[PDB]
Amino acid sequence: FIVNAQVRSDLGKGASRRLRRNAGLVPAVVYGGDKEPQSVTLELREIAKLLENEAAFSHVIALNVGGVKETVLIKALQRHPAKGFVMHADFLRVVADHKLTAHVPLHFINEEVAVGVKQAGGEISHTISEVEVSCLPKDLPEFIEVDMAKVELGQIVHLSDLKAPKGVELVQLAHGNDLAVANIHASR
């Protein structure tokens, strides 16, 4: 995953608003670390093709302004509320030895072979996708698998019942707020 980027040496409301309608660009920044933030302009045509991918946010994405390159992460993208296109991508850096919090999407694999789906008539209820984690960057997962091959009609799978890459701290288990991740419920 590679993004091209440029310098963006002019800032403000009316300047940023005329990149979007004249040039077709998006503003962005890289800031993360103990270092200097950098304003970045970027193309809307290519940032939407990156957001097409299922692993856009939970993946190390390369970026170059000129010849300088960084291990960059997409942290809290911003979006048009009406038409839904990206404005202000807002990236991170990577310092390779701290904990680098991000969001990781979910799969919910075994939904056809489920004891609350097959024998007793019930349907699944996705309550939460894209759990937010805190993990060292080599153990930065694209995915977290959620198994539902034993959940019954009425049983709730929580984040306590969850799983993998084992070097990935879930932020919600760090506090007493344990979140319910899926259900099997009786039909309406």
Binding site: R79, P81, A82, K83, H126, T127
Partner: peptide
């Protein structure tokens, strides 16, 4: 604009007003 109420927060698909 609706900067709040704009994300699909509970389902997979949604009818968003424009």
């Amino acid at each position: 604009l609706a900067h709040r109420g704009s994300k699909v927060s509970f389902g997979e698909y949604a009818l968003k007003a424009t």
